[PDB]
């Protein structure tokens, strides 16, 4: 997260860290959607141009962490993955369309003050809040700049950008299963997600019921925090029937 700030404790209790076991490496973010279901970007698990193809036994998740400076004893929790589900129609080759995966946890995590699931958007939250200029919040432990990484979880709030502006900012054939967010060069702030932030949640607090809803998943960009460029995010509501079908099977 570029031009973010340190998260407060318990600020994002849905935050999940995706690790490679050996060599121990923080790969990506993720989010907790129940006691045993975690959402991330599919390219964290499968991206063949980089020879990336992680299986369940290569990986773990850490949940409830604030800082990477130390082990947060009696606070952070850990689980192995039972099963990985990558979207059947994930398009790594052309445009990263449907950059989404689900991860079933071996052992369900106990909720606490530090560990709590985020909501998936309903028809009202998607129709009402997914609008240009409305801000969402991106969290992660990815790179602090394009050209190192934080100890404390970083947070940035970014406005959704109008689709024709998103379209003309990129040479990628963008689809409806993604959106973009970020400040414009003539605007009065900046910030973006960056390397290592994929799978992390783009969340919105509903003014209607005061619940946090996950609207997007950090997915791609042209560098980080460039003027006239925007961060792209997997559109969670568009892929919600997949999410439910996997979880229900």
């Amino acid at each position: 997260i570029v031009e973010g700030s340190d998260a407060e404790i318990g600020m994002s209790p849905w935050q999940v860290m995706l690790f490679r076991k050996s060599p121990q490496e923080l790969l990506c973010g993720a989010s907790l959607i129940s006691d045993r279901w975690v959402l991330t970007a599919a390219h964290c698990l499968l991206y063949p141009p980089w020879d990336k193809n992680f299986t369940e036994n290569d990986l773990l998740v850490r949940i409830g962490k604030h800082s990477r400076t130390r082990y947060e004893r009696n606070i952070e929790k850990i689980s192995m993955l039972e099963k990985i589900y990558i979207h059947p129609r994930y398009n790594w080759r052309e445009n990263l369309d449907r950059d989404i995966a689900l991860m079933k946890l071996k052992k369900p995590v106990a909720f606490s003050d530090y560990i709590h699931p985020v909501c998936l958007p309903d028809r009202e939250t998607a129709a009402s809040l997914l609008q240009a200029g409305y801000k969402g919040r991106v969290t992660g432990w990815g790179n602090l700049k394009e050209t190192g990484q934080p100890s404390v979880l970083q947070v940035v709030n970014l406005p959704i950008v109008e689709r024709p502006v998103c379209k003309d900012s990129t040479r990628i054939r963008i689809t409806d299963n993604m959106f973009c967010a970020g400040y414009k060069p003539d605007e009065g702030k900046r910030g973006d997600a960056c390397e290592g932030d994929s799978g992390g949640p783009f969340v919105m607090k509903s003014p209607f019921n005061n619940r946090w809803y996950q609207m997007g998943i950090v997915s791609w960009g042209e560098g980080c925090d460039r003027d006239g460029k925007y961060g792209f995010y997997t559109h969670v509501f568009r892929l919600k029937k997949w999410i439910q079908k996997v979880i229900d099977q």
Binding site: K205, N210, R211
Partner: peptide, 28 residues
């Protein structure tokens, strides 16, 4: 999840985080 999206140390305690007003304000 019946209890999803409500944070034990913030909503559940009627406490706000430092930047959430910024989000709720942009919803105009």
């Amino acid at each position: 999840e019946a209890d999803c999206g409500l944070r034990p140390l913030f909503e559940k305690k009627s406490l706000e985080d430092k930047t959430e007003r910024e989000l709720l304000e942009s919803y105009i």
